[PDB]
């Protein structure tokens, strides 16, 4: 599924993410836009054999198992594939873990380079929230 700006905002909110670990809702819509273009079915292979999955592009070397990344720790205890479903519950649930470990949303290349320190509230401008 390919989410709408607004619709994802609303949903991430419903799912406990507005200000989770101190990151505005916008910080999250932003990261997801530039990470997957609101497309939950997105995947991307990195050079190290790992692959990135879903709306929030969670990695398989640590968070989820996709049965073809060796180093692999499945800290989220979910099959990677789960993260691609039209319900974002699994992805949020797992994203909560990632963001709490230690580096905040720095764990997400794209948030850091394209989201961090910009007026992220602009991503939920217009929304019934």
UniProtKB/Swiss-Prot annotation:
Gene Ontology terms: cellular component: cytoplasm; endoplasmic reticulum; extracellular space
Catalytically driven reaction(s): Hydrolysis of (1->4)-beta-linkages between N-acetylmuramic acid and N-acetyl-D-glucosamine residues in a peptidoglycan and between N-acetyl-D-glucosamine residues in chitodextrins
Active site: 35, 52
SUPFAM superfamilies: Lysozyme-like
Residues the record lists as binding substrate: 101
Keyword Disulfide bond: yes
Gene Ontology molecular functions: beta-N-acetylglucosaminidase activity; identical protein binding; lysozyme activity
Chief location category: secreted
Record Pfam families: Lys
Location within or outside the cell: Secreted
EC numbers: 3.2.1.17
Subunit-level organization: Monomer.
Protein name, per record: Lysozyme C
Organism of derivation: Gallus gallus (Chicken)
Organism ancestry: Eukaryota, Metazoa, Chordata, Craniata, Vertebrata
Gene assigned in the entry: LYZ
